[PDB]
Design a protein that fits this description.
Chain lengths: 106, 106
C-alpha cells in the first residue's frame, strides 16, 4: 500500500507468481493488487513484455467455462526469476542495511 | 542497483540515515547512492520536503572547515520513521509472501 511497486518489481512478482503454477492474467493481477496499485492497462503490457522477452510462454485453457490465457514460466523465465529474487534480496538487505546503520558510503 | 527506489523509499532512507546521527546532505546522498540512482536535484527537494513536513530540522555546523547544513530527525520524524519502517516491513513481507506463494488474492 504505502510504498509503490516499480514495474521491475511487478515483473518479479509476475514471474514469481507464475512460477508457483501457470496462471491467467486476472489471477496474477488480483494477487499483485495485494501490494501494488497498478491498472490492468499497465499490468498486461508487462505480462506481454515478459512473454516477448521469453520469460513467459502462454497457452489458452478453459477455466470455469471460458478460455483463459495462461502464462507459464519458461526455463528462461526460471533463470531470470532467480536473478530477480537475488536482486530483490540485495535490494532488501541494502535498504535494511542502510536503515539499520551498517551500510554507509565510503 | 536493479530495482528502482521510489521517492517514498528515499524518504525512509533519509530519515533512517538521519536517525543514526545528524548528517549533512552530501553524506545522506552518498549513502543513498549506494542503492538508488537519484540526482541531488531530486534528493535535496526530498530533504526539503521532509524538513517542511517537520520530520527533519536543520542547523549549520562547521565540518572540515566549511559550514554544512545538518539534518536532524525530529521527534515527529522519529514517530514517522517508525511508520515507514513498519510499512517497509509489510512491503517486504508482502512481496516475499507473494513471491514465496503464501500470499494470493481471495
Amino acid at each position: 500500500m504505502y510504498y509503490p511497486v516499480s514495474a521491475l518489481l511487478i515483473e518479479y512478482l509476475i514471474l514469481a507468481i507464475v512460477s508457483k503454477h501457470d496462471s491467467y492474467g486476472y489471477d496474477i493481477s488480483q494477487t499483485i493488487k495485494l501490494i501494488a496499485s497498478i491498472k490492468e492497462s499497465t499490468l498486461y503490457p508487462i505480462l506481454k513484455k515478459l512473454e516477448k522477452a521469453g520469460y513467459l510462454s502462454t497457452y489458452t485453457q478453459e477455466h470455469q467455462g471460458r478460455r483463459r490465457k495462461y502464462y507459464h514460466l519458461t526455463d528462461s523465465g526460471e533463470k531470470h526469476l532467480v536473478y530477480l529474487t537475488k536482486e530483490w534480496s540485495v535490494y532488501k538487505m541494502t535498504i535494511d542495511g542502510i536503515v539499520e546503520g551498517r551500510i554507509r558510503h565510503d
